[PDB]
Every structure is written in C-alpha cells, then in structure tokens.
Design a protein around this ligand. Sequence first.
Ligand code: FES
Ligand SMILES: [Mg+2]
Ligand SMILES: [Mg+2]
Ligand SMILES: [Mg+2]
Ligand SMILES: [Mg+2]
Ligand SMILES: [Mg+2]
Ligand SMILES: [Mg+2]
Ligand SMILES: [Mg+2]
Lengths: 168, 86, 293, 109, 115
Amino acid sequence: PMKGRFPIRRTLQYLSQGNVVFKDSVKVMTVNYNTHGELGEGARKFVFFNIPQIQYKNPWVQIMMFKNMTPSPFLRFYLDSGEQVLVDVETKSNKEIMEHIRKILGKNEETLREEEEEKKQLSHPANFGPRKYCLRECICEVEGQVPCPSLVPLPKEMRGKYKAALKA
Amino acid sequence: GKATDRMDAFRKAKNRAVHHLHYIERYEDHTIFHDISLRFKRTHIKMKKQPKGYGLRCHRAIITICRLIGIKDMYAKVSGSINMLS
Amino acid sequence: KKPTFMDEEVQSILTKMTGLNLQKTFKPAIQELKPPTYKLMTQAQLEEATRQAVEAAKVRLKMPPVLEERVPINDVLAEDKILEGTETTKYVFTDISYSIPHRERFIVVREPSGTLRKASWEERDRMIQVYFPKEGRKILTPIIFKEENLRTMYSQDRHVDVLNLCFAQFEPDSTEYIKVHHKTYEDIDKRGKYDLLRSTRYFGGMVWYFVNNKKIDGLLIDQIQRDLIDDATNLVQLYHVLHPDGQSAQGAKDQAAEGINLIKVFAKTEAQKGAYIELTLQTYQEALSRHSA
Amino acid sequence: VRSSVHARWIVGKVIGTKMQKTAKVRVTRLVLDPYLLKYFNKRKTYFAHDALQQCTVGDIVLLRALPVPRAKHVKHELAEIVFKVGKVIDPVTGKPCAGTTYLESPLSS
Amino acid sequence: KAYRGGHLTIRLALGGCTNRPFYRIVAAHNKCPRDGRFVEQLGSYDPLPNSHGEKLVALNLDRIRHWIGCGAHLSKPMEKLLGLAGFFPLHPMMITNAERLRRKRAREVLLASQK
RNA sequence: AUAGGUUUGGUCCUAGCCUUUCUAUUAGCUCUUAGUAAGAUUACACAUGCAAGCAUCCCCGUUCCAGUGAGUUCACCCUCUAAAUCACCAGAUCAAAAGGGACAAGCAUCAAGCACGCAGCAAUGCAGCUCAAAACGCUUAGCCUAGCCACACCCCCACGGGAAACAGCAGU
Ligand code: FES
Ligand SMILES: [Mg+2]
Ligand SMILES: [Mg+2]
Ligand SMILES: [Mg+2]
Ligand SMILES: [Mg+2]
Ligand SMILES: [Mg+2]
Ligand SMILES: [Mg+2]
Ligand SMILES: [Mg+2]
C-alpha cells in the first residue's frame, strides 16, 4: 500500500479535483498557520489537503508556508499589480477556505470553459497528419477515396511503372 | 492427501475435501461481491470484482478453484510467496 | 393557422403520450463494461437519485425536430465556358473553416464543363462527413437502409434501432431520413407495434406523422387496449387541433366532447375503423365497471 | 511592467547580508515529484537590491523584479519586509506578536 | 534553424504513398522542406478521383484569407486550385492551357477528318 | 504477469538466474508471385559521372534543398528587438542576436571550486560568490520526433595553418 496517511492525496486523479484556478494576476500565496490550536484546525487541514490541488492547478504561483509565526492562521495573495489580499481563515473549514479563495481570486467556470474552447480550436478535424496531432494520416483512410496502395494494389493503369510502358 | 500410492492420495484428498466444503457467496452467481485484499502467511492475494463476460484473469490455480466454485468473471493477482497450498 | 410540431402544447401532449419508462429508457446497453460502483443511500437519497435519473431520461427523450424535406440545390455561381474539356472530373471544394455552421459551409463543385455550381445536398452531407467525421455516420450509405434489410429489421422488431441508425446517418430534412422514418411508421402501424417506441424520443414523431396523415385509428385502439385513456384523449384532442375543420372536430365542438366522449366522437366520425374502436371502448368500459363497484 | 526577468514577484527568507546594499533570499517553491506525486520544497537563491540595507538575516521578504538586472545576479529588489525577524506584526489584528502569543492584546484598542 | 531571409507561402505538401499522390495545403515558410515544418495546415487536395469521380479539395478559406493578409505567397498550383474553386480569378495559364488544348484538339480533328 | 523451472534428505521463507511474450540486427538452413514501407557498421579514405541556374547584360540564387550524429543541456516559455514578407507604407506575420527561467544518464572512490560576488557615475571600497537540496570534475548520449539541435575534412572558430576533403545522389 502507498506510504503515508491519506495516500489518495498523491494520485493525479485527486490533484485534478482542485477547482481553484487563480486569475493571471495572482503570483504568490503565503499560508501562515498554527500547528496547534482548535481554531487553526481548518487552516491545518487546508494545508494538508487542498494546497497540493491548488499548486497542481496553478503551477506558476509560488505557494509558501509558515508554521506558528502569528497567533492566527491566514492566507495572503500577492498579485501582479502589487496588491496584497489578506484572507483570515480562523474558524473556517478547509472547504470554506477553498470556496472563499475560489470566489475572490479563482477563475470562473465560464472563463475556464472559454480557455478549453480556445484549446479545442487547435485540433481541427479536417487536418491530416501524424496521429499525435491529427485524426487521420492520409485521405486514403476516408472510405470512397482511392485506397492506400500498401493494402489494395492500384490498377496497372494508374501505376506509374506501367504508365512508363504505355509511354514506350 | 498423504499416501505412498498416488491413487490412494487422490482418494484420500478428494474424500476428505467434501467434508470441508465452504460456501462462497457469488454476486449475481458469476463473480465475488467486492474487491478482496488479503495476505495469508506470505502470500498476497488481490482479487478484483469484474463484470459479466470479463472472464477469469487469475493465477491458474485460482482459475481452477473459481471454476469449481461457480465464479466466471474475476481478476486476481498473487504476490509474494506463491506456495500453492498457501 | 396550424400548430407547429415544436409548439408548447404539442410538446406537452407528445411528452405525456411517450411515457417515462425509466427501465426501457436506460436498458443496459451491450457495450464495453466497467465494474459497477456501489453507494449507500437513505430513502431520501434513493428518491433524489431516482429523480435525477428522471431528469436525465427526459433530456435523453428530447424529441428530434420534424423538418420539411429540404429543397434541391441547383444554383450555379459562374459559367466559365473556357474550362470546357480541360478536365474530366469534378472538383469538390469545401470550406473547412472551423466556426462556420455546417448548414452555412460553402461546398462548391467545378464540373468538367466548367460550371461552378453549389453542391447538392447529398454531396454537402458527404463532404461534411469526410472533413468533420461525425460519430455513427458513414460516407457511403449503409446497405441496411435498402428495403429488404429494413424489412428484416422490422421482422426482428428493431424499429428503434432502425430509427437510431437513420437519425445518425441522415439529416432530419434528408430525403432518405424522411423516407425511412415514414416507412418505419408505416410498418409499426401495420403490425400494431406502437409499444416499441413508447418511452423513446421517436414516439412523438410517430404520433405527429399519424395525426398529419389522419390514421390515428390503430394508435388509439392500442392505447385503449393498454388502458391509456388520458393518452387517447390527448391524441384525439391533438388530432382535432391539427384538423379544426374536420367533421370529428366539428362534432366535438357541437356536443360535450370533454373526455371519452372525444374518443366516441372520433370513432363515429373520421375513424376508418370506428366500429372496432367502439368495440374496444366497450371492452374498456366493461373493464372499468369490473372494478368501479 | 515590461521587465525581462522571469519571476515578477517572489517571496523568500533572507539567508545572508554580507554584500553591500544586497540581501540574499532563499525562495522555496513547491515542486511535484513525478513518481511519488508528493510536493517538495525546492529552494533557489536570489540577490535582492536593498538601498536601506534594512534586511536582516531570517527576515521574510517580498522581492519585485527589476526592469533589467543591475548586476550579474541582482535581478530583484526588496519591496516589503513581510515578517521582520522577531518583530512580526500580526497582519490580521495589527498588533505585534511573538510566535502564537500576542505581545499587545487585540483588546487593547 | 535560423533561416536567412525567406517568407511564408501557401503550398501543397505532398504525402500519400507511391502512385497515390495526396496534398496537404500548408502555410509553410518557403525555405523549409516541402514535407517539413509548416506554420499551419489550411486544407487538403486528393488528386485521384474517388468512387464518385470527385477530386476532393478542402480549403480553410478563413485561414487562407488570414495568411494572405499576413503576407503569405501562393504557389502556382494553389493559385490554380483557388481559381478553379472561384476564390480567385482563373489563372492566366489555366486559360492559356485551355486555349492550347482547344487548338491541339482542332488540329487533331482536322487530321482525323482528312482521312 | 494469470505466471512457470531451479537451492534441500524433506518443508517454509528470502533471493538470484532462467523459461514463456513483443520487437530490431546478424548468422545458419530454406524461398514462388504482386502491392507498399524501410535500407553502409564507421564523423576512416575516395576513382568516376552528375547534383545551380535564371535572365535583354544589373541584380537575384548557389546560406535553400539534400546529408551525418562527431560534438552536445545554443532546441522550450517570457522580455527586447535585428533581418525577411505584406507592390511603397502599414503595424501584421516570421524570427536572429541579447536578457530572464526551464532543460539527459551514470560516478561523491569527482567534495571542495579558487575569484568563481556586490556597491559606486567614476574614483575606488566592501570580501565576497557556488556547493552534500550535489558546486567543481570524469565518462557516456544527438533530443523532448508534423520535427528540433549540432557539424559540414582537422586545428570548437578558420584571418591563418595542416592539406586538398561525397556526412548531396549513384558508386568504391
Ligand atoms: S497512407 Fe494513405 S495513401 Fe498511403
Ligand atoms: Mg535471415
Ligand atoms: Mg556521440
Ligand atoms: Mg577507487
Ligand atoms: Mg570546422
Ligand atoms: Mg569524408
Ligand atoms: Mg554517398
Ligand atoms: Mg565495399
């Protein structure tokens, strides 16, 4: 069995469940939290569970942590404009913290879908190329069109080896 | 079955087995009810429930035992010591 | 004026008539199978899951629109008489711009005679399949749609399968789509297999065709036999709605046709098997009295 | 804005100040180990210009990218001392705090 | 490869197999190999008639317009294809080849009649 | 891996080796036909033939294509901005150089490198910078394949020298 408590945290399927994708302005996220205190339990469990998801969904945002530095836990987002967003997280569950950060700085589902539409624009079905980029390597694959010679030999009429004989 | 003669051992074992029958609950009479993870002594068995028509993808002894039981669809991976009795 | 197939009242009537058999709607598909997943649900959770399945079934049952047969295309863009004889094969030029809707794409054909005409509807569908391959559609028309194979499907009682194949292969306004749907409706009526399409998205189309062709006799007979009296009343009302000037409609307007009276009025007037319809209604009345008191 | 440095904003800890008007900051980023899929701190060293020379070893600092490097390695400049070493002021309440203890009770105002 | 000079060109990259020519209309840097890298693929051309006696041609007209605006040149076969499609005027060489074919056909008709 | 054989007088466990599967090269024996794909072992040396012209002279091209993998974190993203195309322009496209970040395998019996930093307009001052979270070093390898990087006989380069160059096609 996978090592560590809650090994589900170390599965791509789990790290893809993160619903928080920050706006392009968010650049740093500092998580101050206390390793003890029944009020800091929400921040502790947020760091334990959701920080992997946030970082996976946001590979360019610098996420840093700080244990037992201030009396109360809190998040602080440094944005590209110089603004700093302080989010108190005391008494809030990890789910509540995730929802709050999603509301204040996360990208809306509509914007995420717009990005996905931009992405799907690329793979034009009608393009022909290697299977990595295109659905079909050649027009031969389309039924009705003259088949690839490698599987169905072409007529001697079309083959150039005998067009040469007709030339002669 | 222990015996000096092979046929005697066969008789002994196949007569003593019928008095030691288990009953194996089969989901829909074709597969186990849930995934089973166990480690008997040094033999790890990981059995996965599978849908109808999936077949028996198991160690050959497990395939034989599943045919005997009445299990038709299941996956099974054996790890560690693969001592047949274990 | 007459009501369109997509009118709200028509949609409500057809949806009620189709039924909502969840088991049939979600019959286990014979496809690649993954192991089932299990959940522990209270009674409230089970009811909520059932209602979500009901919503999914309604979305899946959303009926295809009924479209009139598409007009043939014979537009010619340019007669470049100079090109006559320069080649002996048509050139089919397709606009493969991603954003353009498939019914606005420009698919032109340069003929050997030099004519640059718009592509026929058949060529349009063919090229659109070639360059935007849809799932379940084939370029060369499947042979299943030949009359003998269609009859084989009907004999096996696979009308839903035939309709699904037709919908996937052809467009709603396609000549082949129209012909195959009408043939399937004709076979279903002839052999009295109306129950096949119930709880499927094609029941509404079948009912609409029957009403438009004024042959609701068999469907009403089957509904009465299956004691779907509300559905029969709705069907008779829809028939009168779509034929306001019909004699049955006029009789209903005159008399107090507000229930089984509607079915009686239709059986009397504009029903080709009115005697059989009233015999079945008598049988149903006997059934009702067999448990009323 | 149109700066040629990759990291516009970074946050780190000062690990040395033996250079004139320059603070050495240790910026740690979570990096996903592809095999274990666990996140580990990966640390990198930045040179941040500091005119005031106020940065002290152990301070947590915020660094903003210069328009262009002012030296071979000095790409960033100190923009704020997020947590002065041992003089932390709780951003939430604003009172000075030592660890999880309020030096001045928030009730004092 | 740091290509000294050059410019974009909308041309027909050849694929298929032996005796089965097939073309991908590619907006490719002119100096790049015929079958090499390309900025964007703008459609296809099947020179061999299909079962329906058609030479299918796909043209991503929007992207072709975009690349013409960006300054891509047009290879002569692509110009001829667009002329046939009517997106462009018939190429002067298309017209002149048609006329030459007509004259040759007239000469052969005269020879056949003089028999 | 659905596993199998093999330690012992015998059993259990641990463990190595090997078998079964799928590719590619070579060899042995053997072989009828047609279509298609692919094809020196070597960065050793090369006979011979051909591979770059066009065009009313100027210009343009011969820097492309094609070739090889010797070398090797010049390949990817961002900033800036050359060259080139958009008939002149327009900013658009493309994309050098420069700056920032990322970027192979093995060996730590390669653990220290030896100036590898900063400040100042300069003068000059500070004494610093990298490194067991692997610096410095040695060996190996073309890569992350719509293709990309590097080399073009060697001296990294190529003024110059060694010398007379197929790693263009065919061929030896
Ligand atoms: S792959 Fe289509 S012609 Fe060969
Ligand atoms: Mg051989
Ligand atoms: Mg090498
Ligand atoms: Mg040694
Ligand atoms: Mg050299
Ligand atoms: Mg040589
Ligand atoms: Mg050669
Ligand atoms: Mg030789």
